[PDB]
Design a protein around this nucleic acid. Sequence first.
RNA 1: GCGAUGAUCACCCGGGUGGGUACAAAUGGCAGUCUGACAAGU
RNA 2: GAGUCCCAUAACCUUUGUACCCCAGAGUGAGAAA
Lengths: 54, 121, 241, 255, 385
Amino acid sequence: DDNMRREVQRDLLLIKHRAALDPKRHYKKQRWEVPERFAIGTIIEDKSEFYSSR
Amino acid sequence: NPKAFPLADAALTQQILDVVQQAANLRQLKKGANEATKTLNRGISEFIIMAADCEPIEILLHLPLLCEDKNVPYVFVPSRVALGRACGVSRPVIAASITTNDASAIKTQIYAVKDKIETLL
Amino acid sequence: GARGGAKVVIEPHRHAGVYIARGKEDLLVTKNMAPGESVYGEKRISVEEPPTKVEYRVWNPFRSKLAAGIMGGLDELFIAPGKKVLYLGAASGTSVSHVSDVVGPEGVVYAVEFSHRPGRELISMAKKRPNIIPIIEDARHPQKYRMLIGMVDCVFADVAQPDQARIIALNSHMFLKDQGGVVISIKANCIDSTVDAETVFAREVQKLREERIKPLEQLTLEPYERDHCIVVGRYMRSGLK
Amino acid sequence: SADKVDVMIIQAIALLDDLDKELNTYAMRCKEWYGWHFPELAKIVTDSVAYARIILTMGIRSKASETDLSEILPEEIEERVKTAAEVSMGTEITQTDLDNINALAEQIVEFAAYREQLSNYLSARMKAIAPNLTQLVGELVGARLIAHSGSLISLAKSPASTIQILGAEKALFRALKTKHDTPKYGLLYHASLVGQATGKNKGKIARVLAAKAAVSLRYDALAEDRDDSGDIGLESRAKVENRLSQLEGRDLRTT
Amino acid sequence: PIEYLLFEEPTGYAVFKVKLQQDDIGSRLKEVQEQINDFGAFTKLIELVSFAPFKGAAEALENANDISEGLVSESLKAILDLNLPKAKKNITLAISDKNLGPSIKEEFPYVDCISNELAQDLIRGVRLHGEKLFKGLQSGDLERAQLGLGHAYSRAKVKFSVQKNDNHIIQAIALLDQLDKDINTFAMRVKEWYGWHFPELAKLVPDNYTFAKLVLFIKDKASLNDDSLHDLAALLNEDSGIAQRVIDNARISMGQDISETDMENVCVFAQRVASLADYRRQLYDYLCEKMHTVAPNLSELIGEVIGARLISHAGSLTNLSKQAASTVQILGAEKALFRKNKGRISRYLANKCSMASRIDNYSEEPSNVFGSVLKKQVEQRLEFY
RNA sequence: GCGAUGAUCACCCGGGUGGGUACAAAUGGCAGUCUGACAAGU
RNA sequence: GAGUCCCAUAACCUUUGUACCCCAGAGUGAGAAA
């Protein structure tokens, strides 16, 4: 929606500049202009991953 | 027809076990069904040896389903007591796995037996 | 890395029907046909849309070779929404389920498998996915199941046999459309362990040209797999020149 | 009087919302569980109560050939489920399974049978505790307005503006603090009169209807000798309709 | 020299007549390949002369297996007999399968089967256009029959069965706990509604299911008779003495009398809670029986309800079996299904539980002999620690 | 009379505090119920 | 004049009650007892 909720706006601005978040990561080079169709989602872990990745 | 299938002959079984004992000395052998299940999941298994006289066999029949899906050869040996003796441990072993290592000193023998199991299957 | 409650941004991939989930890490994801369950325990992403809760599945390259193909950057995939696909060597729903996701409800997938132990699992997954036709039959003899397959826009073959070049040809002649796609996953150990990997790939490509399949592209799947390459070709019945 | 307690209204509406959820999940559970035997039904017949009745009339696909489902489904839909029956992918089930799935289906129709009974009871209650309000806004919206305030008296002591926007505090009270425009419908958007309006007239009718709602509501709560007739609401309803017709009669476009 | 063409379709068999024969020497030329794709050119080659749909789904599967093995079904014998002229010189029939050829020849000595590339090419055309060539003849829909036949053909070879099936267990558990929640929720509401009319009873009879049944009897507290006292005394027991208290306290309470219509719902609503508890008791027994049939070894080791929850957590019995011993332990570690010395027994039970699942999943008719001995082995471990 | 069908691996005074996981309730908190005289026709 | 349409029929935090926990997780993999 054109409302472009600031919470969503800051999220995408935190992915355009993700190289500086952590000094040990150093991702590939890419631009990532904001796409005109995208969605925000939450990962759902497997029940077998209760200790590992939850 | 039988659930334990295919079953290696006397000529092949001695060859298989001879690989098992050397893999044990070189720390390239995983012993037991639970270990063998992990190796298939991680994709580090060369092939799986199983005991056809396990009481009951059904407690190791999950391995063939894993073994085929990952295209890992598998074979049954008639005896679990003999298989345990080859592994280098003091108890019977119903299932074992040969870990993958291209730098192993026994690479040729593992690949030789691996070919026979593929033909046998 | 990609823990449970972490939020992610889902955006479309260059290939239709495939999506990317950004964040601290990037994940290749496809939309779920049967929401609320995982077929091989993959991570899933849930999105609220107006509100209905859509669900996405993570595609693990180390488990499915086709996913490794996307990561390496295959230029052309003939698997796309609304296209019939013939999947040879469907061991289980590890990769067919993801292929079923891409084609959409409109498309279909004919999963072909030989061994019965995985077949029972292939049927079980198939019931949840209406657009999958499971064929528990030997792919070396396409005639046995000719009743069960119509024309297919693309053929994907992951069969690990030394004589796969014959399997791909016979199935392509019967069912693949003219100008249709062919995607093959080649494992050099399986075909000829004596000779190096590159020769087998060079040898395998030659057979396809003999069989009236024009190879468009070959990609190696490292670092995900060693000794593998995916060759994408077009079935040019008219002429390969 | 035993017939003039509003606490039955607040519980009845609260129970009704709970029922709509639980009846949904049971309907869902039947669709996967019986859909195992015959997965094509859910796509064809979407209504939950209808779906349960199909199981009741025919237990197994084999019965689909001879069983007649006309009272449940129209002709064109009803033959589709027959055609799907013979070609379907699902597995056959034992009688022990069928009795259990059959028992679940009876719960679906039983709840739907009781759900409409609760709606009728709420209508009778709403027509006895605040008859004027029901005539104007309606029973269902009327009940919710009472339940939101917690009591009939408390709603009566509220001005017309609050009653307009009773069900949209989050949008309203977000808007006030951030200096943006405020909502204009609230809970009344589901009133029948507002639905009839269109365009910007919906906001105007919401204001007019809410103002008359307070008048009809206060007469309901504070009248010592109220007759259970709703006359004040009925005359109030006439005024709102007259405002609606004149408001809608105007055309912005030049003629 | 091709004159007739036989095509096998999931709806039925179709026979065609080849009006014109395509060039043999130039078969690989781009032009003769392109006409196969174009419908305008293809119609000039072949025409439909007959189409015999299958009687039913069962017939289709029988012919699907017969076609798979290169055998001639009674239906195929009929259509060829009706169409192919009797024939020194032999009528030529184009078939896809070389294995099917000898079977046809034995039945019909006067027909010669051709399956060379020329025949294969025409078959490719027929498969390509499908229903377009049938000129509106009722072939149903070629895709829906294809889907149905495929599951039928596949499961026949695998010998899939309902006895192995455990999805029924998964559904029951998700419903059983849902019933438990809804019985409690509505039963709580029944207390509130009848609480207004006579609040003191909700204190007297804490057991909700007892309370619901008793409310069905004492609809109006004003009704108090010694005969009624005995009747409600029959409900549950007078050991608690509630039978006397309710009679006394009903005479003397602040409960506010409510309308008959509202009374009508408290009994009707309480009836619904009563039915659900009755259904929940039935469903729980159904689950108990099914586990004994499906997973006798797992059910005996830990229990019917617990094992079913473990199966649902894995998502299926097969998923549980394939998992390693360590994974099974954390599978029930969120609800403490298996629960330092306390931890050791939990881990030990996990291994045995994993062993029990394997026996259940890969046995056509699992027996409970191995599950019992597995349990006794745990008991000896239990005593030791 | 063992075992790969799996060995091994917070605080304070018997009592009390600290931290964690699943559910339920709260007339507990966030938390504060919009503006107010013109508008429509000739 | 004025965002129902980010479920105020709700989310989050706090308190209480109940039932369990204070070990690792793609857990490890040949010791234990004397």
